[PDB]
Amino acid sequence: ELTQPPSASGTPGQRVTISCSGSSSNIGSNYVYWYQQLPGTAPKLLIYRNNQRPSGVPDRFSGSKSGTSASLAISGLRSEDEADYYCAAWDDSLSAWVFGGGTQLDILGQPKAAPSVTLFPPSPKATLVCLISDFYPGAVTVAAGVETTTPSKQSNNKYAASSYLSLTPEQWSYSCQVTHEGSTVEKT
Amino acid sequence: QLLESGPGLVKPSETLSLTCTVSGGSIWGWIRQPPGKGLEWIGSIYSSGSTYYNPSLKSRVTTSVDTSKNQFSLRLSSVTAADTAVYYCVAWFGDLLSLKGVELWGQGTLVTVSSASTKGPSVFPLALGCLVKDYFPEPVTVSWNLTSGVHTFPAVLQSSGLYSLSSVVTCNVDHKPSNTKV
Numbered sequence: 001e002l003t004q005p006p007s008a009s010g011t012p013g014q015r016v017t018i019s020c021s022g023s024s025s026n027i028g029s030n031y032v033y034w035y036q037q038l039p040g041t042a043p044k045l046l047i048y049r050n051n052q053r054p055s056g057v058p059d060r061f062s063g064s065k066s067g068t069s070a071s072l073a074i075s076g077l078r079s080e081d082e083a084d085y086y087c088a089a090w091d092d093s094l095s096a097w098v099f100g101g102g103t104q105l106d107i108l109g110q111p112k113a114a115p116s117v118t119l120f121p122p123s124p125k126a127t128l129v130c131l132i133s134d135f136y137p138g139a140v141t142v143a144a145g146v147e148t149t150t151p152s153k154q155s156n157n158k159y160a161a162s163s164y165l166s167l168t169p170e171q172w173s174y175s176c177q178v179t180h181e182g183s184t185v186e187k188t
Numbered sequence: 189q190l191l192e193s194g195p196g197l198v199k200p201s202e203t204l205s206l207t208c209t210v211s212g213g214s215i216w217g218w219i220r221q222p223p224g225k226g227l228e229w230i231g232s233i234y235s236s237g238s239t240y241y242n243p244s245l246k247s248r249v250t251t252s253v254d255t256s257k258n259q260f261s262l263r264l265s266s267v268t269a270a271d272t273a274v275y276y277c278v279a280w281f282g283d284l285l286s287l288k289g290v291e292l293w294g295q296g297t298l299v300t301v302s303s304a305s306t307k308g309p310s311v312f313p314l315a316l317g318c319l320v321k322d323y324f325p326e327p328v329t330v331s332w333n334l335t336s337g338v339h340t341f342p343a344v345l346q347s348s349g350l351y352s353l354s355s356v357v358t359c360n361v362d363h364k365p366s367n368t369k370v
């Protein structure tokens with residue numbers, strides 16, 4: 001439909017380009033739109049009419065279109081630019097709005113960070129809550145009745161996860177071991 | 189942002205209904221995003237009345253606009269698990285006064301298609317923070333009294349099919365699908 005690379009990366013202070021490839025019936029004959037989407041928020045329109053910025057959008061974002069291809073350019077990259085970017089256009093043969101698959105833009109240069117770990121005891125039942133925050137890169141290992149979340153990107157572009165050990169009050173010291181880049185911390 | 193409303197839980201085979209408030213515009217439409225996936229166009233209605241739908245949603249979509257009451261609406265009938273997504277309403281204005289390229293989006297409403305019942309969460313103190321456990325469906329929102337040092341973590345889905353999450357400060361729990369405030 002509209003095809004975008006799944007991934008891009010850029011360096012703070014530098015530039016990135018995100019491509020969007022379509023056909024004569026869409027990009028070839030209609031205006032291209034570009035969106036920035038941060039996780040868990042609505043898309044925000046960055047570009048309309050191929051190359052125009054809505055009021056309020058920084059001039060660091062620019063757009064262009066040649067034949068059946070379009071590109072979003074971002075200069076003076078900052079960490080907060082880390083987001084999913086989508087292209088969109090009307091398609092004449094389909095009579096439909098079509099969207100690109102999105103390009104996940106990652107911003108390089110983040111230092112390694114050890115996880116902040118907090119373990120809460122139980123306050124009828126018993127749940128041990130291990131909370132893991134502010135780590136980078138976004139992978140950790142935690143060590144019956146264990147349920148551990150996948151790593152999710154925080155709004156500051158570091159990572160978080162939580163682990164939950166379910167026990168009966170009769171079963172209930174206990175320890176949460178969090179491993180990140182060979183380094184393990186225990187809470188008890 | 190546009191004010192988007194409607195239930196966050198729909199049973200399979202029943203109808204999903206959402207509404208947004210908007211003053212004016214040129215095109216009103218709906219877009220959705222399944223968990224971990226891209227943006228999918230549902231349908232658009234133009235100020236002409238011309239209306240267009242995603243053909244894969246066969247005969248299941250109905251969109252409408254009532255400009256005189258400042259609203260537009262989506263109905264999606266006969267839903268299945270495949271219709272679980274965050275749904276957005278969108279209103280295109282374009283170049284307005286001095287303003288240019290105006291497009292407004294609803295905040296996004298998670299609709300989960302499931303035959304399981306709503307279940308309000310049980311809230312327990314962490315000592316600091318709060319534990320919000322055994323609820324369905326998503327989401328819960330947690331506020332305190334305080335905005336600094338507050339970290340609310342994404343929920344875990346336990347083997348019971350129920351969710352749990354925790355919010356920490358370095359609590360006002362709200363579960364709209366069960367209408368519970370702790």
Ligand SMILES: CN1CCC[C@H]1c1cccnc1
Nearest residue numbers: 033088215216217232278280
């Ligand atoms: C003009 N917008 C650009 C991409 C989506 C499109 C739009 C907005 C509102 C209703 N339908 C389509």
